[PDB]
Structure formats: structure tokens, C-alpha cells
Design a protein around this nucleic acid. Structure first.
Lengths: 245, 139
DNA sequence: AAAA
DNA sequence: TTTTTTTTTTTTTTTTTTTTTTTTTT
């Protein structure tokens, strides 16, 4: 509103994005009904299908925009291939900060690792989460954009995570009164949002620790240098930090 | 600005001089706008072109914004050391003149100037001449 | 920065 | 008759201009 009018003039990084979309992204207007569109900007509710060059140019500008503030509503739809974009709107009992301790993280890392074992296999853990300061506390979002398994296979993964009780006690270790129902049944089939995109009447999320692990076919049980937005994004198969697992 | 207005809405307005010697404005009524009952698809006499006054300040601003963004785009592209002067003086003068369209006196002057462009001879005396046309409430 |  | 209303009497002026005018040279 009033704030959004300010960034359009005061600063030029948003203005830089405006020039790119008016000329380059303009020709890539895509119908909303079709699923071919990969970019859905909620600033104006428009769907865009961008190729790799148009995507990466869009991604690159996004990080600089976040470093200088501003507000954005850019979203990307969940496609037929993506990483573990599994939102967890954890409705805690109270707004008590549960620390993402590496011991507790390894509990979550290994259990979600266990779930992806009983599926198609031959791992970058992006622990983005809500800035909190709201009733119902934050929404944890682990993302593994390297792999390409965004199909009904993830629905079995969705069911396994939802039916999982091992993660439940780990969330119970965090003081969460909602161990499940945080993972929506359509977590890996509904449009997602690029890291740093502001939400409807809510601030953009932040990433706690963007760590990673390694997976081996024979033995399964094993940051300011990359553009964050593309790295967390699922479509970026040509990613530098991430690789198309 | 009057010429751009005429080229942009030349199909909805017409001006002619009555017997008393004063210019009058006629507006073509289209569905979907506030109006009295029964004058659809008919010319309507207007003492002062209110719709043109609103349209000058409402829709023309989009074209002005397009000009501004065009100047911005040419500013972004690097050509030489002269663009940083020409596409800064021209730009500055442009935002200085941009707010002029919102002034009342400038709008009145633009309307008076456009009175000449929109004038169409042999219109008033040709109104309601042929007896084979009747003005009804639905056309 | 003040005068045209 | 017829008596006077009509004709007259106002009523048509204001919107620019001016002002300012930031800039631009000093």
C-alpha cells in the first residue's frame, strides 16, 4: 500500500525488476488455467512461464531486492518435478522459540531422510521458517530442491510424513502441540513461494541454516557464495549450490 | 495535448456553433455510463464536457507514465556521456510539466483549444431533419 | 546562496 | 375595451492574464 509506493520510487532495485518484467517477462504471459506457467506473481495475480535464462535473470534480481528490503508476492507453482517443498504451519501451544539445534535438526534430517528411502532414489536442507511474532508461532519449511520427484510418489511421501510418529516426538521435543497437520496433504502439489517473497499481510520468511548432507546409492545412510532464491527454488536444475538429484 | 485528446476520443464528441454564436458540446451516449433514462445511442447536449474533463486527468496519466518509463528505459541503456545530460534535462522538464494536466486553468485552456479540432460543420441544422427516424428509449 |  | 404584456431588463465575465516560476547564472 503506502509502503509499496515508497520502494517503487525511493530505491531502484525494484525499479530494475520493473524494467525486466515490462520488456522480457512481458512476452511470456501464460494462461492461469494451464500448468505450464512456472512463475505466479501475486502482486497482480499474473502467471508467467519463464525459460532458464528468463528464470535465472528473475532469480538473480530477487536476492538483491531482499538485501535492500521491499515487499514482493512472487510465487512458483509446484510442478511435476521439484524438491521436498513440504510446508509445516506448526501451530505451537505458545510462541516459545524452539531452537533449531543440530542435534534436534539431525533428528528431523534423518527422519525425513528415512521417508525418502522407500521411494525413487539414485541433499540440501534449506530450513526456511516464519519470522514468528504471531499467534500459532512459526511455520517450519524444510526444502530439498535438488531431487526431482514431484508426483504421486510424493503423495505417498506426504502420507508417510503425515502418518509418521517419529517426527511427532521430535516436534514434541520442541514444545509443539501440533506435531502433525502442519504438513498439508497437498504440500507437494500446491504452488510454493520463492524464498524472500512477502506473504499476504505477513513478512517474508527467513532461512535459519542452509546446510546439506550426502546420499550414496550403495550406502544410503550418510553461505553468501550462491544466489539464495534460485538455490532454494525447484526449477533451477542448473543451480550452483544444488544439483539435480 | 488537445490534439492527442482529439485523436484519442474523436468518435464520441462533436462541437458546433448555435444561432446565438456560442460553441456547444454534444456527447454520444453509450451503455454502461450514468445517464438520464431513454437517451441511449443518441447524441446528448452538454453545456460543459464533464466526461472529457475527467478523462483528461484520469486516462491521460497512463500515457504520461508510459512516457516516463520509456525515458527511464533509455536512461538505463548505456550509450555515451551525452545521454546522462540529455536524458536528464528532458526527464526533469518532463516531471516538471507532468503535474500541469491536473491544474484547472490548464484543463480549461486545453478544452478551449480542442473546441476547434472537434468542430464539425453542418451539424446543428442537420439535427432531426429527416422524418423517417424516431428517437426511442432503446435506440 | 542570492538575485533575476 | 383591453390592457398589457411585452419589451425591457438585465444577463449574458471570466478566464485567462496576472501572479509565480524553479532554475540559472552570478
Amino acid at each position: 500500500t503506502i509502503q509499496l509506493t515508497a520502494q517503487r520510487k525511493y530505491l531502484a532495485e525494484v525499479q530494475a525488476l520493473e524494467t525486466l518484467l515490462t520488456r522480457e517477462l512481458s512476452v511470456f504471459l501464460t494462461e492461469p488455467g494451464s500448468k505450464k506457467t512456472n512463475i505466479i506473481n501475486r502482486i497482480t495475480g499474473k502467471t508467467y512461464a519463464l525459460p532458464s535464462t528468463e528464470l535465472l535473470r528473475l532469480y538473480e534480481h530477487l536476492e538483491q531486492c531482499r538485501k535492500q528490503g521491499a515487499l514482493m508476492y512472487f510465487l512458483e507453482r509446484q510442478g511435476t518435478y521439484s524438491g521436498l517443498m513440504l510446508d509445516y504451519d506448526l501451530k505451537l501451544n505458545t510462541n516459545a522459540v524452539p531452537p533449531l539445534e543440530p542435534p534436534a535438526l539431525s533428528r528431523l534430517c534423518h527422519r525425513i531422510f528415512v521417508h525418502i528411502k522407500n521411494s525413487s532414489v539414485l541433499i540440501h536442507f534449506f530450513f526456511t521458517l516464519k519470522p514468528e511474532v504471531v499467534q500459532g508461532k512459526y511455520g517450519f519449511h524444510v526444502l530439498i530442491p535438488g531431487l526431482k520427484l514431484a508426483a504421486s510418489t510424493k503423495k505417498s511421501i506426504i502420507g508417510s510424513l503425515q502418518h509418521d510418529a517419529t517426527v511427532q516426538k521430535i516436534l514434541h521435543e520442541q514444545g509443539v502441540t501440533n506435531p502433525e497437520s502442519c504438513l498439508d496433504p497437498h504440500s507437494a502439489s500446491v504452488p510454493s513461494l520463492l524464498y524472500g517473497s512477502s506473504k499476504l499481510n505477513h513478512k517474508p520468511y527467513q532461512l535459519k541454516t542452509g546446510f546439506e548432507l550426502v546420499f550414496d546409492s550403495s550406502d544410503p545412510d550418510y553461505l553468501e557464495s550462491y544466489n539464495l532464491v534460485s538455490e532454494l527454488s525447484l526449477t533451477n536444475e542448473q543451480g550452483s549450490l544444488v544439483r539435480p538429484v | 495535448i488537445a490534439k492527442v485528446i482529439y485523436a484519442m476520443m474523436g468518435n464520441k464528441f462533436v462541437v458546433d456553433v448555435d444561432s446565438n454564436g456560442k460553441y456547444v458540446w454534444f456527447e454520444f451516449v453509450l451503455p454502461g455510463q450514468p445517464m438520464n433514462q431513454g437517451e441511449i445511442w443518441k447524441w446528448r447536449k452538454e453545456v460543459n464536457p464533464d466526461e472529457l474533463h475527467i478523462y483528461i486527468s484520469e486516462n491521460f496519466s497512463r500515457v504520461m507514465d508510459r512516457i516516463t518509463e520509456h525515458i527511464k528505459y533509455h536512461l538505463s541503456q548505456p550509450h555515451e556521456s551525452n545521454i546522462l545530460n540529455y536524458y536528464k534535462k528532458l526527464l526533469k522538464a518532463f516531471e516538471r510539466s507532468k503535474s500541469k494536466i491536473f491544474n484547472d486553468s490548464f484543463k480549461k485552456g486545453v478544452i478551449r483549444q480542442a473546441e476547434f479540432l472537434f468542430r464539425q460543420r453542418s451539424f446543428i441544422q442537420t439535427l432531426d431533419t429527416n422524418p423517417h427516424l424516431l428517437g426511442v428509449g432503446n435506440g
